[PDB]
Amino acid sequence: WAESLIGLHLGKVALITGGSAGIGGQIGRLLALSGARVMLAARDRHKLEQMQAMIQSELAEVGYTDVEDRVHIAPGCDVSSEAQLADLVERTLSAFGTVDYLINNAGIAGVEEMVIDMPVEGWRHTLFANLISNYSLMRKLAPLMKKQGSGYILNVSSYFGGEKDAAIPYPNRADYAVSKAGQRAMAEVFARFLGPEIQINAIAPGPVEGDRLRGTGERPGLFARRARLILENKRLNELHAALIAAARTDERSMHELVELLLPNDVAALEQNPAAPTALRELARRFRSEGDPAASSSSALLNRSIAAKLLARLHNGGYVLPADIFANLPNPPDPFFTRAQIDREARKVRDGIMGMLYLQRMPTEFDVAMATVYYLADRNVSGETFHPSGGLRYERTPTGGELFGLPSPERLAELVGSTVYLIGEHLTEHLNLLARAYLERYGARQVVMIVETETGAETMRRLLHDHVEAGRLMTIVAGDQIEAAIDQAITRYGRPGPVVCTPFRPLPTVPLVGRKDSDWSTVLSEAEFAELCEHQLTHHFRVARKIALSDGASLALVTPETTATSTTEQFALANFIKTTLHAFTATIGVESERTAQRILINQVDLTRRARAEEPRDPHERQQELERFIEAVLLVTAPLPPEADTRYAGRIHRGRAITV
Amino acid sequence: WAESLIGLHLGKVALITGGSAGIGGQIGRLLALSGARVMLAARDRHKLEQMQAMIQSELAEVGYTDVEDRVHIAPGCDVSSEAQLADLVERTLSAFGTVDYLINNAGIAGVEEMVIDMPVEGWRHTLFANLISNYSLMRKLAPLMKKQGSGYILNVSSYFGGEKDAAIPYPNRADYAVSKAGQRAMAEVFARFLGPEIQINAIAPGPVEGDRLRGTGERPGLFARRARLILENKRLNELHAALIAAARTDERSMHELVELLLPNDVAALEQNPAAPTALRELARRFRSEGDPAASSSSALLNRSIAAKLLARLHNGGYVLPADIFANLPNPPDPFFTRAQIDREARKVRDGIMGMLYLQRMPTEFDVAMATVYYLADRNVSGETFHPSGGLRYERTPTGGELFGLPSPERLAELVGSTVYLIGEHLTEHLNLLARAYLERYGARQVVMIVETETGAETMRRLLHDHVEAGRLMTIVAGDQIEAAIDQAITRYGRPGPVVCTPFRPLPTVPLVGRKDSDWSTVLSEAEFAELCEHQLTHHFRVARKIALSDGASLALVTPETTATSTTEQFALANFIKTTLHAFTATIGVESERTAQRILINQVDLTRRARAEEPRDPHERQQELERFIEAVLLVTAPLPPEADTRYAGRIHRGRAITV
Ligand SMILES: NC(=O)c1ccc[n+]([C@@H]2O[C@H](COP(=O)([O-])OP(=O)(O)OC[C@H]3O[C@@H](n4cnc5c(N)ncnc54)[C@H](OP(=O)(O)O)[C@@H]3O)[C@@H](O)[C@H]2O)c1
Numbered sequence A, B: 001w002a003e004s005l006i007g008l009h010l011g012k013v014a015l016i017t018g019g020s021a022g023i024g025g026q027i028g029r030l031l032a033l034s035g036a037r038v039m040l041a042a043r044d045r046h047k048l049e050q051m052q053a054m055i056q057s058e059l060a061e062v063g064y065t066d067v068e069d070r071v072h073i074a075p076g077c078d079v080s081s082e083a084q085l086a087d088l089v090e091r092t093l094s095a096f097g098t099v100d101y102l103i104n105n106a107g108i109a110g111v112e113e114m115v116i117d118m119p120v121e122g123w124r125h126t127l128f129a130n131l132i133s134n135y136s137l138m139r140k141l142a143p144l145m146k147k148q149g150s151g152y153i154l155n156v157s158s159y160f161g162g163e164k165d166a167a168i169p170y171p172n173r174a175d176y177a178v179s180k181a182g183q184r185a186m187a188e189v190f191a192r193f194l195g196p197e198i199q200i201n202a203i204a205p206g207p208v209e210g211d212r213l214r215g216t217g218e219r220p221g222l223f224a225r226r227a228r229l230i231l232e233n234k235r236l237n238e239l240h241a242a243l244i245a246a247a248r249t250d251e252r253s254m255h256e257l258v259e260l261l262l263p264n265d266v267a268a269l270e271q272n273p274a275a276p277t278a279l280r281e282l283a284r285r286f287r288s289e290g291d292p293a294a295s296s297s298s299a300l301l302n303r304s305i306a307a308k309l310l311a312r313l314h315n316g317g318y319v320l321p322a323d324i325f326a327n328l329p330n331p332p333d334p335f336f337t338r339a340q341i342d343r344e345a346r347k348v349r350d351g352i353m354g355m356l357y358l359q360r361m362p363t364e365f366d367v368a369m370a371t372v373y374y375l376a377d378r379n380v381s382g383e384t385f386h387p388s389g390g391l392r393y394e395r396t397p398t399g400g401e402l403f404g405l406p407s408p409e410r411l412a413e414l415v416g417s418t419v420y421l422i423g424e425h426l427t428e429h430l431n432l433l434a435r436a437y438l439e440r441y442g443a444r445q446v447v448m449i450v451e452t453e454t455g456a457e458t459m460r461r462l463l464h465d466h467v468e469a470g471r472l473m474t475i476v477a478g479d480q481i482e483a484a485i486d487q488a489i490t491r492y493g494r495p496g497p498v499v500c501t502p503f504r505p506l507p508t509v510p511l512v513g514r515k516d517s518d519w520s521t522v523l524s525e526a527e528f529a530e531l532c533e534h535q536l537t538h539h540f541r542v543a544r545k546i547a548l549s550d551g552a553s554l555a556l557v558t559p560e561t562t563a564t565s566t567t568e569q570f571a572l573a574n575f576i577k578t579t580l581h582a583f584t585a586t587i588g589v590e591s592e593r594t595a596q597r598i599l600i601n602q603v604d605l606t607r608r609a610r611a612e613e614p615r616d617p618h619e620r621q622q623e624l625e626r627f628i629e630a631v632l633l634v635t636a637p638l639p640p641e642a643d644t645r646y647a648g649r650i651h652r653g654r655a656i657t658v
């Protein structure tokens, strides 16, 4: 089976992150069998030692000699740590000299929570381990590759990282999906810069067969554990959505509404004539869809679900005592029956197996083999190879440019509205949006949330008339956007429409260095992390907070490219646009599937090429008018009757290009 | 170099169309070296005999025996002929038994003309040779593959066939681009049906190095020949656009306007105070951009360009004597200087080489090698593999669903308009569109162009009020849509907005047969040709005629999928949607780059999955209202001041999903 592999990569030096197990282990194994010297990097020394021993044994079996010199390991290497990545490169260059192939394989599953339950530090951790790490290793190794005249960077993405012009929603995995899309976007935008000496591509396998206790989750190993978590999550989502909906149209405070849940009695809530319709209707559903042997059919929640619900409400600025659930009656086991858990487990498994046209999942070996053959191809860069595929799954096309204004019915819903605008750099855009909502669409007030006092003063001067009239209020958020939103909620009221633009512009540093240079001025590992913080994490933090705070709509705006932008700015802008599309699509579907009203969409001020950009003042005025139209199209709320299943799916998770 | 190849496909039987030369020859060669028995099919026996001899010699050199039994040829096989395809399969099965790998490689460059210069029979020929042939061979071979439990269909598409969710415009190659996109779309939609026994994928290489006198044109061999044709085409386009524009706002007939060109004198046209501004401005440009040593700088045209211009005008319903150019002064050679031709030739070459990130084109051998390694992958279906890539080129994302109505400024341009609606099956859509344009937007008249008397009567009864009032006229086109449009032009006037819907619904036959069946009821080769005629060629014929006839706008409407449509109908609909996107994108860019006013876009009534479709009367009314909004968004003409370079590119070549 190895006859076509032996010799294919003879003389090459490869570094494989996550090379002690899974797909990375198989890629390391097959590259070694192909004749490459390999450095396997991971955290656990024992597993690395086992993998090294197995590969060295197989190398000896096929005739290699001095096998100890062909397979090295780098234990203690957590790819989320910049220091460990620097040490990894020092160790690898000391052992083998210049690296020919960088296999950015390491990937963690991540937080595995919906965005509104996702800790901000957890999201950052996923980006560091799965995406920023890929740039860091490229930044350290590409200089030597360019000097020698040849190199290869392979980022191991996923089918769920999307594809060119199509986002793939991955509910409960936004952090992971964004990391995977960024890996592909990096290959797509860096190819022109790294050529002709260096190839950069991504692989995007679908679900792969592997250890049930490991993996990135495309294949769920423990379907039953996954099933129970889905059921606990569903109870939380149903209770949270009904409470948020009820509070929007009830005179009772969220505190008073949560008090209705304290008896923890489904039938009592359903039969309470003074209970909000949303909560009575939910109670009926719990009884109808429930298993009489499960306590979840007679009890609303348990301590675990209650704590997670309380966190959602507190994180949305709702005022409730921390001990509100201290005396919650504890429902008797089982809360969910083995029958309910087993049925959901079958649903999860059949859902995944049913995506496969070939009705079989590839093995890690199969994926590694296709990948090692692919690496021999010297005529591909900026591409995403699917070693496994044939999947029935939902895609959300991105990049549409032909659109108009929303219906007068949606526009009428803006009258008397409280609008939140977030930004700093795009002063003209923020001014025009504030005036549009206030002067043309009758919003009661606009809260301008900026990063700095200088930004606040700039906007206050641009909107002096509305400031003097009490219609434009300014808040300075700094690096505390959640606390700034809490200030807005308490003093000005919860938001209806929200527009989120980036505080910062894109950097203008080089993305690659001259062949015989030290690359001292090239985008740094820290600068790349900063780009992700200002252009991805910024939007995530706002989306998470606004969704938890019951905002009506949210437009995520990407950085602006102009006919004057640097070629590097165009590259970074397109990187952000593609990567954020993964976030927008994922949170749009999460929100739709969980009965959240919030409409989340993306408005792109970035374009693929300068030739498409406005070249004169007429074209510029056309562009700024399209920007306002695009924002209005995604932010004007749907008259509640129109939020059909059909229309609701259309108005969520989409991206349009101005 | 063949060590990793020998043994990879041992035991397999492969059929390679276009296997005497080019990429197909290399695929046949490497599959044979890999251990497969191969049938090479093409037209010329001599070239097939040479290729067979070369491969047999190489097989003997590497140790194969009885090489005459491992490489067969099928001369006289024009893939555009169904009869020859049937004979090819009989010959192949007689020689080797069941085919494991069908390599649909054969591809012709096609007409190589803009749509408005493209003979309808030339387009049909390209579809037969490059696309329908692929279905025909699959229809004959897939039954045996499914019976044996294994098979592989590989369609050799092109990067210019687009990708999932993105059309790639290929100006002057619409027939080719559509054929290439169809090859990929076939793999994408048939994968679920052919699995799990059969894999179907496409390869989409970018430009490949090869014989300058051959190839599909991604790499132009004779840059200079290509350059001269570009210059002759540019003269035709500039003259045609100015004449069409002038006739729209001048009292003179096209006959009288063409008379201004008969002295064949650029300076005289520029200096004529009574000449239309468009023609005087063109004459100035010919002088400014011209080479004084070229007769093209002092003369407007030559007999060749004049004949091609006259054909355009006649094909657009303009009335002119056939001998109008009989006494045209013949400009002295050179019409275009070697300097002008050489500069354009450098532009063509640098344009192609500049698309490459790796600054080198792959060889046919390189592409074949990557392809033969790819064929070993058993975990991919419905995918498009890029054996070569890394290209800077324009893409037009498709599949956007979030849009609204056009501006009141565009809508005002419909008042007093002459609208052409084309269709038969979608009676409700045609009725609602006619009433929208007539009752809400003030169109003067709607010409309803249907296929049959039964369709005409159905529409006349649905629109009885407008018929009685002289605002709805009906024409029966049958299979003569061009002649029907000519009738509309002569009796009712040239069209402003035009909506083109398919006359026919999609078929409901099976797309694959049961394993132990004869597949007698499965979509036939003839039925697949008929699908292309009714769902692709229909739109091409209308777009070509409407563009030549100076229509203002044109909406190409794809077939309708409903929550009730068969799974097979969803597959065929998505096949058409993807394939037509290639046409819409290509003709939109051709029109924009050639100064044609016509706005051509696509409105999709097809969706990827039934779950996205309306499920109740409320959702259905939302859908039909979105349909009218989508059509209005692409058909309301641009106030001429607004047709900036920026806005013009946005409003052409786009597709939206209702
Ligand atoms: N599994 C799938 O179905 C699938 C599908 C598509 C894409 N992918 C992608 O394929 C790649 C590998 O996935 P997999 O399923 O093989 O994962 P896996 O089985 O969890 O891979 C584990 C390997 O990664 C190492 N690792 C884990 N966390 C690490 C960290 N923070 N730093 C460094 N090394 C770390 C492990 O050793 P230590 O634990 O000792 O560190 C071990 O070597 C990922 O990028 C993933 O997104 C997987």
Ligand SMILES: NC(=O)c1ccc[n+]([C@@H]2O[C@H](COP(=O)([O-])OP(=O)(O)OC[C@H]3O[C@@H](n4cnc5c(N)ncnc54)[C@H](OP(=O)(O)O)[C@@H]3O)[C@@H](O)[C@H]2O)c1
Binding pocket: B017, B018, B019, B020, B021, B022, B023, B024, B041, B042, B043, B044, B045, B047, B077, B078, B079, B080, B104, B105, B106, B107, B108, B129, B156, B157, B158, B159, B204, B205, B206, B207, B208, B209, B210, B214, B215, B216, B217, B218, B219
């Ligand atoms: N060339 C490129 O840069 C490029 C790039 C992307 C994709 N492609 C695709 O690759 C495939 C092969 O292209 P190529 O450049 O190799 O073409 P090519 O050099 O013209 O290939 C010629 C081969 O096709 C045969 N052939 C030509 N017309 C035929 C017909 N009507 N029926 C049957 N066989 C016919 C020729 O023999 P006879 O003339 O005797 O029939 C010969 O065997 C096509 O599908 C093409 O679209 C090519």
